[PDB]
């Protein structure tokens, strides 16, 4: 387990720069409209904005060290997040290194923290918005040069959302059903439609073919309707389901997408664009590398055309490893199993807030006792008056005591995003750090 | 099913007024520090503040009518809530009529809408806060004459919360564990401690004895510790679990609470106060009346003392029936069961927001097709890009079409409270109405 991969970052930043004669390390322009010099500047600006304290070196030990340091308006026992914006940059480097053909459009949904949106803008990523609110948060902070840099990746959108994307100049919008075509034709006449197709996502963590993605069969009627309502079908997308380690799935989807491209021509549509969506893991089994190994060949084969630009929509990739949550053990009490003793503890974050992922994301986060005392049957609860606000139930774990801290790493995705403010408890304190050298 | 019970409201307001010579209709002062005239005024003020449109008459048909009317800055298809603040008042009347001995302290957690907090303040209710944030929301809007009118009903609270309740002048605080006593003694020396005990809550909708409530046995050591850390034990509380229809449970708890009162004396504690917590249903099997029938006797028997004031902490009671959610069906598509056809629809609210109750509250809300078309295998989803944002899966229901509306009544409790803002979709539009005559 590595605390960082300086190497990649270096290379990432160098490519397209004067210090290598504007030379790219693959056939492909660096992502974004900025020059390599312009890009390194824009990023240092953001780091300054958010008072990012650089802090260089295992990942676990990097976190345990940083946590001891950050424990000593907000209270001293309050819960807080250490956000490594360096790990975000590193993930962007790791992605260019492995898939330069593919330009990442970050999925805002996964963590819309303004610093994270700002870093990714400056690194040349595009934006995947699912609502009028997400569109307005990208345009109102001007994180793009153009509304061509936003994909509206919600196959099913309200009419007031279609209207506000039209008026904002947004173009690239998803579809997967007949009734949706009609709507796009109407509210977005300036629309470059992309067809989302179904996948064999049964291997994922979160499988979305249930709700979204036209099945292979229906593609034909969908195409037919696009021609009919005067809708410009400029591409094909897919998602193999969030947190999917199945490599066969990505291969399979590209194939299916090819056969569509073929079908599209017959209706008067030259497809420019191939969106391979998300599902790539953000934490160090199946690696992101192993996945790219099996994708690059296939992109080469069928979309090694050259006539078609290739894009992605990762969310979890970028943010998951970035965040560590710190929670104080502020209360405790012991019970009797039915002298066998249950040790119950009460921590200042939980299901209603950061740990909603346990339910919406099927997450199983790691609970790290900061200064590891015998193995107790332990139960841990969040601050709320509800008994279901429980993150661990009657499972072995060290006896703890009050004042102790829990460190939860890899909490950057689908946690705060969706988190609510029940019983009026939120985690507000944010410590920004960087694990990577950039801005001296 | 009745759209209102004018009768009760009338009586409620009359009692303690000049028009009946300041005469109460039971041995017991009207709730609150306001005179009956002062109380009716304060309430009309709030109704004016929130531009409440009175609208008098089944409950279902009252809602269906009001919904047709309210369908025609916010969009015309946006989701919205019709909030009947009259039903809140009515619930307060219904409670005085049935349990004048018992002063209700409203549990903010269940729905902290400022208009709901304001109405309940003006009707003479006290406040049940579970966090420093809930305490600050009641004091910062000055909804009490005194910090004696707030119970801090969180048996397990962070030290920064204990500190801020001490500095705010708050006194009445819950406890159920030794380690907690020590903490109260320290941060709150001005504390009037109330002991929470366990219950046989196995019949409830939401059972909280798992996390909270000292078991009968442990009471003795707890008492002992209170005497020891110089802590003033002024009472006993309990909760029979939220949405509990079991009448035996309320009888049982009062009994257990009595035996505690007895135990308390031996340590130097004269208990003033009996908090019967919550669990009372808010919607029209087991009725609220049936429950009061079995409680009043027992309160009479053991706490018909007269030396002891009796209080409650209902949350759901007050708010549940108050709110109706309206959601627009904005998209749809049909699939093939494995020509059997699944009809999938997409509505502008869902699991991540108002329908989180399906998961945290085990709610099973009612879905009402506004203008009821044959019975389809239907699946309904919320606006978010997640497949798990699904409120109905493959169950019979009328074929619908786009532009249709769904009415969900009885959504006032443990919905918006806890609701989050994932994918940046929230319900914001609020239509305030009243089902009860008061303010001409």
From TrEMBL, chains A, B:
Cofactor names: pyridoxal 5'-phosphate
Disulfide-bonded cysteines: 44-439
Active site positions, chain numbering: 385
Keyword presence, Lyase: yes
Ranges in coiled-coil conformation: none
Protein keywords: Lyase, Pyridoxal phosphate
GO molecular function: ornithine decarboxylase activity
Residue positions binding pyridoxal 5'-phosphate: 196, 239, 242, 279, 315-316, 414
GO cellular component, one term: cytoplasm
Entry's EC annotation: 4.1.1.17
Residues the record lists as N6-(pyridoxal phosphate)lysine modifications: 109
The Orn/DAP/Arg decarboxylase 2 N-terminal domain, residue ranges: 86-320
Organism domain of life: Eukaryota
Pathway per the UniProt entry: Amine and polyamine biosynthesis; putrescine biosynthesis via L-ornithine pathway; putrescine from L-ornithine: step 1/1
Catalytic activity: L-ornithine + H(+) = putrescine + CO2
Protein's GO biological process: putrescine biosynthetic process from arginine, via ornithine
Quaternary context: Homodimer. Only the dimer is catalytically active, as the active sites are constructed of residues from both monomers.
Family: Belongs to the Orn/Lys/Arg decarboxylase class-II family.
UniProt-recorded name of the protein: ornithine decarboxylase
Organism, as annotated: Leishmania infantum
Source species taxonomy: Eukaryota, Discoba, Euglenozoa, Kinetoplastea, Metakinetoplastina
Residues of the full protein shown: 124 to 689 of 707
